[PDB]
Design a binder for this molecule. Structure first.
Ligand SMILES: [Ca+2]
Ligand SMILES: [Ca+2]
Ligand SMILES: [Ca+2]
Ligand SMILES: [Ca+2]
Ligand SMILES: [Cl-]
Ligand SMILES: [Cl-]
Ligand SMILES: [Cl-]
Ligand SMILES: [Cl-]
Ligand SMILES: [Cl-]
Ligand SMILES: [Cl-]
Ligand SMILES: [Cl-]
Ligand SMILES: [Cl-]
Ligand SMILES: [Cl-]
Lengths: 312, 304, 312, 304
C-alpha cells in the first residue's frame, strides 16, 4: 500500500493534508515529522499534534525536527503571548506528549528498518529534515520509493516572481533533495493554484456537519483571509494536500518529467526550481524528476470530502 | 511613421528584419549599427552592408560597434545564400558615438531603438551619454523569454552573451518591449509561408527563402519544431502594427549572478497588469501568425 | 586538563596531531571522529584506527562521520586497490573494532551527557561533522568550551590565492561553524606555515629511537615529498598538530581576536576565511573568533618530541 | 620623462596628486579626466579645474567623463580649503573619447594612464577602442589592496565603487601597477612632514597643508592611524622614482560575485615572483617614506 512519512509545518494547508492522509484508506501514515523555518518549530509541532488530536489520531507518532535552515539564517516572526494553535479555529490540547527523538533520526531509523522501496516521503514544508537525513544516512536514498513534495514552481512564483516559499526558506536543503538519485514529484504552484476553495466546494464540506468538517471549513476561511489582498484569486488555493491527492490517484495530478534543479546563488532567482522544459518529455529511466501540471479539480475535492466523511 | 535605428548582428534572422524594415513604408530606417559577441563583429558588419546592398538600400548608413561583451569574455557572408559586394563603404565612426550623436541631434521622442543582437552598444551608449535615455521613444529588442529559454532552460542567447549590458538596458527609465522566445517561437516558417514567398519570384524573395532554408537547417535537430521560428523581424512587426504582437506590462530585470539562471529575463507576472505610468517594461506574448507573415510577404513584394 | 574530541581525516598531519594529543598529559582525548571530503571516509577512518593502534591507544573510541560535503559534490580521488594505511609508513591492523553509530550523533550524545563547558572540539578536516552536529542539536553550541580548528588563512591561501583546503572542501559547513556563538580559534596557514620540519627537528625525533618516533619521522618524510615542488618551502610545514599545541600552551600559538566569516558565493574567493583586521583588537566579550598568528617554533617542536618520548 | 593622463575624482588626495604631477619636472601632465561614483561628477570636475587654477596650470585640459558605474547603481569645492574660480572653461568632449583620441594620435608606448578614482572611464575607453590597450605604456592606479581593505575587511573604495570596470582593466594585456592600501597606509602625514610643508610659506603650501588637515579630520575616528595616510599621489611618486614605491609581480584579478569579498583585488602571492614576461600585473609593497615626502615638498616649492 502507499506508506508515507508526512514532513510538514502546520500551517493550515498542512492540516488539510493530515486530514486527507488519515481519511483515505489507501494511505498508511507511518508518522508526522515537523520542520521550522517558515514558522517556528515549537508552533508547528504543537499544531501538528493538536490537529492529530482533533482527528482522534493520537496513535500516529509526531517527532520534531530541525528548527532552522541548513545554512541561511532563521527568519520567522516573534512568538505572540496568547497564540497557540491554528489561527481562526480551536483544537483540543494534545493528550499524548510529543514522541522523543529528533525527526531526522526517526526518518532514518524508519527507512532503514522497513523493506526497501516501500516508504514514500511527503515533504510539505522547507526541505531541511529531508536534506539532513540524506547527509546523515546516504543509504536512505535508494531505499525510498518516491519523494512527493509541495514546493516550487516551474512558471509561477509567490514569494518572488520566480520562487516559492518552501524552497526559498532553505534553498540549500532543496538543492540536496533535488540532486539525489530518488524519484521526485514536485507539486508546485503551477499545480496548487488550480486547487481553488470555491463556494460550492466549501458548501459541500459544510454539509458533512461534523466537528472535523467544520475544522476543514475553518481552514478554508483562513486561506480566504490569507489571500484577501491577492487579486490573482477570487477563491484561495490550498497547497499541501495536493501531494497526498497525487499519491491516492495519479489521474488527479498530472505530471511531466523534466530535469529540475534549485538556484542557490542568484540575486533575483534565489530559490527558483529551474525546470528544463526544452525538447520532448524524457523517459523515467533518464529523468528522476517530474513537475505537477494539471489538477482534476472535481476529483481532488471529492477526495477531500470523502476523507472528511470517513473520519466522522 | 516610426523612425528606427536597427542595432543587429546579421545573422540570418537580422537579415529578415532588415528586409521588413526597408520594405514596409511605415518604417523609416535611419541606419544600421552592428555588434559582435554572438558572432564576430567583422562577419556581421559585412553581412549587414551586403544585405542592404541586396535590397538596393545603399543610402542607409552602417556603423560598426562593440566587438565583445562589456564584462564577460568574448566567445565567438551568410551561409546558404549569396550576397553582392557592398557598393557603399562602411561609414566611419563607432556605432555607440553615432547612436548618441543621432539621438542628441534629432527631436526628442522620435527615435525608436531596435536591438536584435546582444545589448552591448545600447548599454555603452547609455553610460557614455545618459541624456539619450529620456529622448528615446521606445526600445523594442529581440531577446529574452519569460517562460522559455533556448541557450539554457531559462535564458536566451542575446541576453546571455552580455547579461551586464542587458541589466543596464532594462534598468533605465525608457519604455521597453521585450520580444522574447515566448513570442518568436510562434513565428513559424511553415511550408505554406515559404511557398508564398517563393512565388514572388525575384532575387530578393529567393534571398528570403534562402534565409528560411538556413533556419530549417539550424533547427533540424530541435524536436520542439517541425518548422523553424524566425526571431528578429518580430520587433519590426510590432512597430508596424501593435495588434501583430500583443504585449503584457510587467517588471522585468536580468539575472547576472546566478549559476543556473544566468542571463534570465525575470518577468514578474504576479498580480494584475500594471499601468504604463507605473511600469516601463512589457513582454511580447501572442503573435498574429497570419498578419505577421503578410507583413513579410508585402515587404518583399514592395522591394521588387 | 583539556578534554577533547578530535574530528579529523588522517592524513599524515592528523596522525601527528593524534600522537601529540596522546603523548601530552594535559590532553584528555575522549575520542576520534572522522570525516570524508578531502579523502575518502573509508580510507581516513582506517588510518585513524591504525594510528591509535600504533600508539597503544586501543581504549580510544573511533566513530565514522559524514562521507561528503553538506551541499557541494564530493570531489575525492579514485580508490587504488593496493592502498591501505598512510603512504610511506606501515601501521599495525587495528585490534579495536570501529565503534558503532554516526560520529555526528556520538559528538551530540557526548556533549549533552558531559558537564557544560568541559569539552573542546578540535576539527582538523573539513567542518562537515561539526556543522551537522550543530544543526541536529543546537543545544551543543553553548555547552562546548571552545572550537580549535585547523583551517583557513587570513593572508595566505594554498588551494587558491586566498583559500585553504579544509574550508574549501565544505565552505557551507565552515560558514555554519563560524557563525555559531561559541569561542573559535582558527589555526590557519599564516600560523602552520611556520611549523617547519627542519633537518634539526627531524634529527631530534629520529634520536628517540622507538617505533613511534620512526613513524613520526616517516610522516615528516611524506610532508617533504608532498611539498617537493613547492618553492615557498625548503622544509615542509606540518598543520593539524598546531591545534593541539595551542591547547597545551597558549604561548606556543599566539592569537588575535577579529571577526571571521566564510565566503560561500565568490568566484575567485570561494572558501576564503575573511578576517576583519581593521581597527584595534576587540575584547573576548565582543568577539568570539580569533586567528592564530605567531608560532613559538622551539616550544612547538619540544611538545612533539616530549609527546613521542612519553609514548615510548 | 613620463607623459601621463590623470584620471581622477578630486577629492583631497587627488588634489595632492595633481600638485605632485605639476611640480615634478619628470612628469608631463597631458590632461586631467574626471569620474563620478565615489563623489558626484559635477563636484569633482569643478574641484579638478579649481585645483589646476590654484597651481597656475590653466594650460592643462580637463574633460569630464562617466558619472556612474558601468553596472551597479550610483551611490553618491574641497572641504576645509578655498579654491579660486577656474579661468579656463571645461574642455568639450567626453573624457572617454578624449582618452581614446589622445592615445591613438600619440606615438605608441608613450602615454601612461594614472587612474586615482573608480576605473569606469578606463574600462569604457578599453571597450570603445580595443586598440588603445597595446599602445599604452603602463597603467598605474590607486586602488585595491592585497592584504588590507578599508571599505570592507578585504576591499578598497575605488575598486568597490565599480568592480566590473576594475575587472575589465585588470584583465587587459597592458602593464599594471596596483598602488593599493598596503602601500598608501605607509604614506603618513606626520606633524614633522606637515611642519616642513607649512615652512614653504606660499598659498600653494597652505593649500597642501589644508588638504592634510582634511585627511586628519577624515581619519579622526580611525584608531589604526595616529596620523592619516595620503593615497593618490603615491601613483605619481612611483612614476617619478621606482625606488620610492617597491613592487612585486603577481597575478591580480577582481572579485565581482562574492558576498563578503565584493571588490577585492585578489593577488596570488603563492610561489616565487614571476617575470615581467609572464605577469603583466604587480602590487605596490614598500614606500620610501623619506623620499616620498621629499618629492611632495620639492614639487610644492617648484610651483611657487
Ligand atoms: Ca506547509
Ligand atoms: Ca540577431
Ligand atoms: Ca586533516
Ligand atoms: Ca581619488
Ligand atoms: Cl457530496
Ligand atoms: Cl508516462
Ligand atoms: Cl526539417
Ligand atoms: Cl493597454
Ligand atoms: Cl546538564
Ligand atoms: Cl631532545
Ligand atoms: Cl588577551
Ligand atoms: Cl558596490
Ligand atoms: Cl587627530
Amino acid at each position: 500500500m502507499t506508506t508515507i512519512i508526512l514532513d510538514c509545518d502546520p500551517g493550515h494547508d498542512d492540516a488539510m493534508a493530515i486530514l486527507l492522509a488519515l481519511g483515505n484508506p489507501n494511505i498508511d501514515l507511518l508518522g508526522v515529522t515537523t520542520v521550522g523555518g517558515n514558522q517556528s518549530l515549537e508552533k508547528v509541532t504543537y499544531n501538528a499534534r493538536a490537529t492529530l488530536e482533533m482527528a482522534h489520531a493520537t496513535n500516529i507518532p509526531v517527532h520534531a525536527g530541525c528548527d532552522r535552515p541548513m545554512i541561511r539564517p532563521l527568519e520567522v516572526a516573534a512568538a505572540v503571548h496568547g497564540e497557540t494553535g491554528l489561527d481562526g479555529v480551536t483544537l483540543p490540547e494534545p493528550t499524548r506528549p510529543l514522541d522523543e527523538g529528533h525527526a531526522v533520526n526517526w526518518i532514518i531509523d524508519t527507512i532503514m528498518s522497513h523493506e526497501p522501496g516501500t516508504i514514500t516521503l511527503v515533504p510539505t514544508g522547507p526541505l531541511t529534515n529531508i536534506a539532513m537525513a540524506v547527509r546523515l544516512e546516504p543509504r536512505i536514498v535508494s531505499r525510498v520509493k518516491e519523494v512527493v513534495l509541495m514546493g516550487g514552481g516551474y512558471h509561477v512564483g509567490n514569494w518572488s516572481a520566480v520562487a516559492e516559499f518552501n524552497i526559498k526558506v532553505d534553498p540549500e536543503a532543496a538543492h540536496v533533495v533535488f540532486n539525489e538519485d530518488w524519484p521526485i514529484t514536485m507539486v508546485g504552484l503551477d499545480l496548487t493554484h488550480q486547487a481553488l476553495c470555491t463556494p460550492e466546494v466549501q458548501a459541500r464540506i459544510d454539509a458533512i456537519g461534523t466537528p472535523l468538517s467544520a475544522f476543514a471549513s475553518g481552514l478554508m476561511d483562513f486561506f480566504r483571509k490569507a489571500y484577501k489582498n491577492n487579486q490573482d484569486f477570487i477563491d484561495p488555493p490550498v497547497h499541501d494536500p495536493c501531494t497526498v491527492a497525487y499519491l491516492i490517484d495519479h489521474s488527479v495530478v498530472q505530471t511531466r518529467r523534466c530535469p529540475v534543479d534549485v538556484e542557490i546563488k542568484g540575486d533575483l532567482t534565489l530559490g527558483m526550481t529551474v525546470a528544463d522544459l526544452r525538447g520532448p518529455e524524457p523517459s523515467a529511466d533518464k529523468c528522476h524528476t517530474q513537475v505537477a501540471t494539471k489538477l482534476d479539480f472535481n476529483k481532488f475535492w471529492d477526495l477531500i470530502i470523502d476523507a472528511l466523511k470517513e473520519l466522522k
